[PDB]
Every structure is written in structure tokens, then in C-alpha cells.
Symmetry: C3
Subunit: 377 residues, 3 copies
Amino acid sequence: REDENNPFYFRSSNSFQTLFENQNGRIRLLQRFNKRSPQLENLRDYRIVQFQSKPNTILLPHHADADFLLFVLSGRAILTLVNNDDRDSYNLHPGDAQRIPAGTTYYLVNPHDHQNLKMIWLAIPVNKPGRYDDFFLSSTQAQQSYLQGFSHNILETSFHSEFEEINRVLFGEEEEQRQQEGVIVELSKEQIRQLSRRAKSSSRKTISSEDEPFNLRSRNPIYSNNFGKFFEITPEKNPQLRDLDIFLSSVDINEGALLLPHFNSKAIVILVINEGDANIELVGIKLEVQRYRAELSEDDVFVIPAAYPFVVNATSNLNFLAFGINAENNQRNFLAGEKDNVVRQIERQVQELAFPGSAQDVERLLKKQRESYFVDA
Amino acid sequence: REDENNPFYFRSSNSFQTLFENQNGRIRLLQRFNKRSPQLENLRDYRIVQFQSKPNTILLPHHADADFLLFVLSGRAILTLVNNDDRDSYNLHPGDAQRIPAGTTYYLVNPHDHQNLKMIWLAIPVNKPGRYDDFFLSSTQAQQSYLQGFSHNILETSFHSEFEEINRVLFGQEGVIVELSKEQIRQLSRRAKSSSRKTISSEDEPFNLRSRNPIYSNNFGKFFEITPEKNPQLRDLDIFLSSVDINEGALLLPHFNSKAIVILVINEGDANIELVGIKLEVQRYRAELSEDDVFVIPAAYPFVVNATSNLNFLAFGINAENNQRNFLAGEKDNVVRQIERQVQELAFPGSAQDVERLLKKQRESYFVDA
Amino acid sequence: DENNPFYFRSSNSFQTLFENQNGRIRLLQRFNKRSPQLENLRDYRIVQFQSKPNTILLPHHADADFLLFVLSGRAILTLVNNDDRDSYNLHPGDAQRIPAGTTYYLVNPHDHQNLKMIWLAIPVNKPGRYDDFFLSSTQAQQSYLQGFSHNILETSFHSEFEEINRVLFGQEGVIVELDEPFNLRSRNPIYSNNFGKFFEITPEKNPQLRDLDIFLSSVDINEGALLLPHFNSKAIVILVINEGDANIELVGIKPLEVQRYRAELSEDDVFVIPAAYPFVVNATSNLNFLAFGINAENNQRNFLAGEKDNVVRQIERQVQELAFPGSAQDVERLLKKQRESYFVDA
């Protein structure tokens, strides 16, 4: 079972509906994990969102029908969350994760003058499982302000103004030239040079922060050697992550290397390729062993059900982000290698029954791979 | 999307199914939220029940496979929860709320001699999402005791008696809501505990929403609300309760709840509601509301309430924990005003001065003179 | 019978997962596909496990959280983690939880006397449906490791496929012929008389159970006696008959019409009582059933006859004379004729 016929593989060229596109940027939405394959029913409440904007741009003020968990892959972002009585600005860098609670009004700036901003947001809708909506305050040539949803009368009395003034100042649909083109607009260094001022960054101490942004590489990867690096922040360590019962991981795999076969005890992992190419082999039980395989590339998404063993083989320098749903107390069990090899953790005698070989034949074999987590392919 | 084609509008005249009814009172169950419209799939575990009783009446003893959050719209009530090893009676007044764990045997008295008892109970069924059953102990005519569910042999071995005795004494009044004398009523109202400022955080006793200052208040309206952070019962249901008053010819400014799904039910008066959804195409949903009418405001959808006559509504806020209420006009809690000047310039066709001048014209907050 | 959506008879209700000379593993049918009235039990599945003396279930794991309970016999449950390990000596009555996706193997270190167990399953990837992953390699199944190609297997193991295949790939079946677990009856029961005993461990008492919001109860009913009519306030109970047999009458609510659900239960039988649904258990021989309390936190047990926990006897006199046709006097006169509690003779 491979490509297309593989329910866990989500080739990017045919798995994304774009919510909005412009010459200034683009927001894409991965299709529903369960509409795709009913086998991923417990991921019905989640959605993957890809975001990218050009230098000097800003995603206009809006709020969504869902709770988001942002992650910066590359570039710098300036996230400002506007509440009803004040405001909070965060300067995000690659590796940064920040939580935007459901229904929170915000805008996002890419302050880099010669570079793009690339992100991956995890959406968790509140009203209808798996589906949400963006409400934009602004009125652009691309979409109406949601305030246009109330009648002139209410707007007039609500704002204590004649509708002519309300329309002129906030909507301006009578002269599109005074309107912005879409939800993502370009800026001049001048403008940007202003918004950036006043903004909190992440730092060693925020890994434990209740509301500030935290970086995945603020600590030593849990696994690291000549072939790859595996960084991960768990619910136990971060309060935002604990609220969602999710873990985050960023892992690098060198060209020609593979992340040993292994499985997660309880976490359903959503993995998306950020860069590179790789071959992933997943194992299910039709007790006939079922082989699910695919060739992954940039922007592809692949999900690994809990307890399903898998392997990532890098055909070029690779890097992927990973969301561990139902992460609480998860245990990663490697099937090969020295460290965390659940296999070679069984009692000699039991190993003898489990396999044709024997006490020594088994262990002798399980001792041939001297490396751990990442090995050379 | 006008009232009828509006999936979030529930006109009482055609949205409730009567469970029981006689000259003494009426219990109504509102149609399932999601089977009305798939857009409210996340309310499937919830159901609204309306309870009306005449002066000097009693809802006979019974339990249900559903958690119940009671709320007294008007009138007075004596609620007594009968546990397996004791009994607790409660004197409920208007604005009082109380959680009734699922499967708790109880009976409800209307102690007044001239005023009706009106209540709205939020039900959260335990066995099947959105559907539950009432198990009445009494053996009236409108229904048999669920005790008659066991065969004669069992009933006899159980109570240690001849079936004729058990049958004549327990299995043999009319309906589940019967009338009674004023003397019988005083005999049942003497031990009822009332709510009080030191019960707001009670884990099992009734708390009054209005026994505290409202969060928003002025010449045109009063907005009362108790959250999960303040009350442990609400925290268990992750719900917030709000009671708001609006003077005729006034409205509750456009605003949206960040994460709460609101179940709005009209107590008295009338009002026009405008809810706005998306699909980016803006969808308009409006309606004219009256007593007993229900309307749900999905989380994050902006809405406005325009009272056509002295109004008061009750609202259950689902997924209440940390909900943030954002207004779009008015001085206080106006999220639009928190947007940086530069971004207001970008986001709107007008300048920064234009937006700020416009955003400051409405000098009041929350409620304004329509 | 067979028309009582709450009755599950070990005969046409289960489905053998594995079966061989050394034991059997049956997986109960889905509560919800069975009857739409048991939707809130869709995440749960019952598994009946049996193993003859001196046998062992080879290493494996499932994408499901388990709650084991020893109906009879002894077993040595060993959990193998990614860098540690710890075995538990299970005795009848002992309860133990196996976190989802944990690799483990179970043994029967006794002769003659077998291993009889019931497991509560809570699947992780898709409600009510899980899969077992066996590391071992036998004629019954391939090791899941065979899911990886030769090249990949060669690299991971740093060895020519020739050997990983000779030492790991190619016995008979999955049952070859060879925090801390808590015992239910290790403490005094809650109800105790001459006709039976009622043992129960609630979530508020055990942290493992608190995790699952589940209570465990083991009750005994001397033949002739019966568990007095009663209903759990909020818990949905799944009872399984261990020894003996008995009759059960469960009353539901269709004017409101009383619905009746009754059945004759035997060994390995399973029956579910919806929360708040009144019922009675009548032992037609020495009886002992196991019960899983779902949605357990703060559950209240209300009896309808007897001296203790009699919710009916807790209703105010006036209201009683109002609820029933008899007088306030003839009602208490009646309600007081049973000096027994929980269990009474028949």
C-alpha cells in the first residue's frame, strides 16, 4: 500500500485547499484527516495549516473559530494578540512555538526585508469538529469586514455615528482604491520598523512559561549523534502544551541516514516535512502485518497512529516538525540500537521463545547495531 | 437567513416536545441542537428543558440519566434532593441555579399561592448523548412506577410482603405534577436552605447569579455572570451562567465570545438578534425573539441584541473556561481600540485618526440607547 | 433474552482473537454497534483471556489501554519498557493497568490451575477498535518487524538480512507452552451479610482507577439470595459473570412506558446496566460477578428496598402519601418490613 492508496500519506500538491492567496503570501489548509481515511477518526478535531508571506508583510487583524498552536519554520515573525483591554506582542524565531487561544483577535508581521516567513499552525476548532472560520475585521477588496454583517441601523447606533462616516472610515467598498487588496499586505521598512518595537522573545526560561513563546532547541535534543538530531518538548515541561496534551518535536536527519524503526506508546503523531526528501515505512496489522509506505517531500504530511512502528530514511538533508497528539506520558520504543531498544529489554528466556533463535543468537544480533536512534544508511 | 431559515433560531411555538402536561404544570424538552442543524454538532450532549408549575404544586419524586443545571427564571421553588442516606431541601429564588448530579432522586415544589414557577434546566444526558429518560417513582395514572419494572416474585422477596400489599400500597393520583394544600406546603418548606453570598462557591448548594454586582451596568442594562473560576459546580460542567437585562429601546453592543458557545433563552420581553457568521463571505442570521425562545451564538461569532421591550434573557455558556468577551464599539472592552494605530491604518480604508475618531464617538459601554 | 440489547452471552457475543492448545483470547462485540443505546460505551471493549498451566503469551503490545483483572489463578505479568522492566505477581482479585502501547508478556507459573482473566480495553486510534502487535515470529503470525523492507532491516540491525531472518523470523501460537497492581478483596467490602458480600474500589481511592474514571466491584450472592433492586446514579456498569449463574431484571423507560429487560446469565456472560437504570441480580446458584464502573467519579448507589441506602425511605412522609396510592402510614408500614440490606434471601 503506497502513495494515494496510503491513507496516512498526504502529498502536498493534492491535500491542501488554499484559504487565501496573494502575491504577498498564502494560507493553506490540509484536508480533514478523517474525511480522507476514516481510520484517523481521533484526529477529526485537528487541522494542519501552512502559512507563508513575503518580506515586509502583515496578515491583517482577525480571529478564528479555533485554537491555534503556531510554529516558525523559517524567517522571523511578530505576533500581536489583541485582547479587549490590552495587547501582547511576541517576536518569534525559527523553532518558536506559541499558542493563540480560540477566538483571540490578532495580526502577524514578517519584519524581514529580504526573506520570507514560513509557519505551520495546528488548528483545533471549537464549534464543529475539524472545521473553523476566520473573521477578518478589516474590509479589503478580497473580503468584507464582519461588521458589515450588522445592519446600517445597528452600526449607526452601535457606533453613534451616521453610516456614511462608518462606511467611509472602516469599509470603503464604494472606492476600492482606498481598500487594501487582501488579508496580507505589503509594507515599507518605515512602517515595519515601528510594529516590531515592544515584543517579548523566547529564552531558556520560557520553556516553562505559561503564556510566552518557547523554543524547541532551548535544550539539548533528547537524541543526538553524527547522523541526526531529535528535539522535543512535552506536556510535562510546557504549560501551553499541557493544556492541549500535545508534544512538539523538530528533528534533523542527514542525507543518507535514517531514524531507527520505533513506535510511540500512546501518541498519534502528525509529521510534516519542512525540508528535504525521505522514505517512510509504517507498519499496521490488517494478524497480517500491513506495510504502508511513501516518498515524502517538502510540505507533505504523514500521520503515524499510536503504537504503529515506523522509520524515516533521509534521501537528502531532512527536517520535519511533529505534533504528538495525546502526548501525556508517551514512551518512545526503539526496535534497533543500544539505547531504548525495547526489544533487547526482554528476558533472555522470553527472547528464546519469541524467536526461532536462542538466548545468544538473539542478543548477538541485537548487539550488532552499536549506534542509537540515528544510524548510517 | 431570517427567523425560520436561521439554524440558530428556536421559536418555542415549534421547537419543543412536551414531556408531560396537565392543569398543574408543563415540562418541555427542546429539540436536539444538532439534528436541527449540523453546524451545532458540539452541543449534541446538551438539551434545554423548560419547567412551568402552578402555585401550590409538586413535581413527584423521580431521577433521570442526565446531569441537570437548574435555573429559576421567576417564581419561588423548594427543591429537595433525596440521597441514599439523607435528604436536603433548598429554597430557590429567581436567579438561583443549582447542579443536580445525574441519577439523583428529587421532587420540586412551587410554594406560592399566586405566582407561577418558571425554570430552565440544562440537561447533559449520561447514557446517550442528548437523550435521557425520567424514572418516576410514583404510581400515578399518567405513568407507572419504574418499580413495576420488576416481576411480582422479585418485588415480594425484595420488600418482604405479599404482592397484594405492595400493589395496593405502591402501584394501586393524576400526572407527575399534582396539587396540594397550603398546610402540606408549609410542612415541606420549613427546612429549605436558601442561597447567600457565602454559597457562590458552594460545591453542592444553590448560588444566585444576581446576588453579586453585574460585570457591566448602566442606565440601559445590567449584565450578570458567574464563571467556572468562581463556582465549583460550573467548573465541573465547564459552563458560565449569565443573566442580562436590557431596557426597551436599548441594545447589547456587537461583540463575540472567544471560546464559549452560548445557549441564549428569552425570559421576558422581546428583542431582535443579529448574528454574523462566515462563508470570505459574510453570512447574516437574524430573528425576532419572544418568551421561551432559544438562540445559540456559536463561539467567536459576533452578535448584537436589540430589546424591543423591557428584556431579560438567560444564557448558558458552554466551553466557558477562560472565555473572553470582546466588544466592537463602546469605550470599555472594545477590542478594535486595542489594535495599534499603524495597523488600524493598514486594516481600514480610513487613516489612523479616522478610525480613532470614529471609535471614540460612542462614549458609553456594553449597553447603549437604541 | 437475545432481544435484550444489554445481554451479551459468551456463545454468540464474542469473537475468538486467537485460539490454541494453551489458551484462548476472545474480544467482546462492540457495545454500540450492538445497541445504539450504549453509545457512551463505544470507546470500551471487553476481552476474555484464558491460559492453561505453565504457558505464556509472547511479547507484543496494542494501541489500546488495558485494565486487567484476575478472575482466577495466578499470573506473572511483566512490563518491558524502553530501558527498564518490572514484573508483577498477579493473584485472583488483583487489578492492574497496562498503559497503551506498552510491550508485555504474561505467564502462568502454576500447574493444573489455570489463568482466567477479563480485560477492559480502551483503543487509542479509532474508538472501539484496536490491534495487537506481536514481536515474536510464528506460524500463526509474522513479526511486525517484517513490515520493514530488507534494506531497512539490514541497516537498522547492521546485519545481512540472511541473519535477522534466521534468528527472528522463519513456534505455534501466541500462547506457547513454556502504579502497583492492587487487589480488590484485599480490603473489607462495603456491604456484608449472610447472603453475599459487595467489594468495590472507587476512583477517589485508587490513582490508577482515577486515571480512567472507573470503579471496580466484585460481588458474591449466595444461591437463593439476590442483590436488592437499586441503580447507580451516574456510573454505567458492565458486569461479567465469573462463577455460577443468576437472573437479572433491568428496568428502562420507553404516556411513559416502563420497559423490562431480563436474562439468564452463566459463566463468561456479560451484561450492561445503563447509568440510573434500576436493576436486580438474583442468584440461581453460587454467584460471583465482576463489574466495571464507567463514568465513576462520585457515583451514588441507591437501593429501593431494605434498611440501608434506601433512597425511597428517605422521601418525606407527605410526599410519599402523595407519590403512592396508599397512606403515609401504610407506606412506611410496608417500607419497614424488610430488615435486611443489599442482600436478602429468597
